[model samples]
Target: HTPTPTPICKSRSHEYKGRCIQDMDCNAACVKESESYTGGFCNGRPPFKQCFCTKPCKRERAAATLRWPGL
Candidate 1:
């Protein structure tokens, strides 16, 4: 069986205006299975998702790549 990709979805509690600085700014606020996006903002799927920096594969900095940075 193929490994399941982690889900990153939107949240109803925490919301933000303007663009997110990084993926953590969004993924951390929403559910792992779903991501939230507004019109003309983040438009795409998993790999092409607007917040690439948040995904596990695109951690440009070492700090965000840690197993659990803020946790």
Candidate 2:
């Protein structure tokens, strides 16, 4: 069996200042935050536009961490 990448994890840009108009500009700020972040998009309505960044969540790695190995 193979492991497919998990649903992306994203958060509002802490680094990007002010409201976002275009995804293009926010992407640049996203990259600055971290290269692992795959994207930055202007989200929400015109009144509440926010720059959101995305990255893959690593769950499988945590799966390897054994909590109860007594079988």
Candidate 3:
């Protein structure tokens, strides 16, 4: 028992080399690229998906999951 899961916030990739293939490798880029980054995933249309890094939001909101357009 500790703390509730913090809401996740995403920031577009700044260091990813090319089209992010999968969450599997994106997460790898996320952590290795920085320590604060907890996870990452691919977004946008397939065959051209972009990478987005994720971390716990500093603040919580009552609103539901956040959506980012034009990944």
Candidate 4:
């Protein structure tokens, strides 16, 4: 018998604006906001800084999951 492929759930958090320097900083923000804090990152890009949070799509179904900005 062949092995079954696992379903992949995709989810992301709204980008938060801040002077974030490290990835952890972004993650912290998500956690503080109770967003997708499981997998988050910081984007140090030109024009502005942002924090990106991510998690399984199922988590969003739990309840009012905040929509990520620029998604």
Candidate 5:
């Protein structure tokens, strides 16, 4: 994976990076803004949220029926 600083972007934009190049090995948390925040957000802020994927899963684990054929 490419090493990059924690990226910042528009609040309503799609996904964002999970970590920064400087702290990639450490915590490397991303700084972002959301409509929910007062000053947007970066580095640190109140009501921060973890990054999440935008795609929806086609199937759920609960619907699975197939099993391992053999050991």
Candidate 6:
């Protein structure tokens, strides 16, 4: 049998503002938002770039709990 991969949790940056410029900006905001996290990254395209911070999800909050529209 194959081993299952762990799930991750990510949230929009609360401190991130303006267009996405550099990776450092996102990472900095992530640090302030969540302590001891993986940091943030730019995920959106130009004209409207956004930062997303992520961390390992607890077992009780696995993605499987959410319903996918087409799954």
Top candidate on lDDT is: 3
Model 4 C-alpha lDDT versus the unseen true structure: 0.56
Candidate 4 per-residue lDDT over residues 1-71, each given as its tens digit = 11213322423455465668788877676667774445567777778676676554432233343457355
Ranking by TM-score: 3, 2, 6, 4, 1, 5
Off by over 4 Å in 6: 1-6, 60-71
lDDT of each: 0.36, 0.69, 0.74, 0.56, 0.30, 0.65
Error of 5 at 36 (Å): 25
Where is model 4 more than 4 Å wrong at Cα?
Answer: 1-16, 58-71
The model with the greatest TM-score is 3
Lowest lDDT block of 10, candidate 6: 60-69
Model 1: which ten-residue window has the lowest total lDDT?
Answer: 52-61
Candidate 1 colliding pairs = 7-32, 8-32, 8-34, 9-34, 9-35, 10-34
Q: How does model 1 fare in lDDT?
A: 0.36
Q: Using Cα atoms with residue i matched to residue i, what is each candidate's TM-score against the true structure?
A: 0.23, 0.54, 0.64, 0.49, 0.17, 0.52
Model 3, 1-71: lDDT tens per residue? 21356767777767783676678898889878988888888665655667888887786665554456446
What is residue 11's positional error in candidate 5, in angstroms? 19
Clash counts per candidate, in order, are: 6, 0, 0, 1, 1, 0
Runs in model 5 lying further than 4 Å from the true structure: 1-15, 18-50, 60-71
Q: How well does candidate 4 match the true structure, expressed as C-alpha RMSD?
A: 11.0
What order do you get sorting by lDDT, best first? 3, 2, 6, 4, 1, 5
TM-score of 1: 0.23
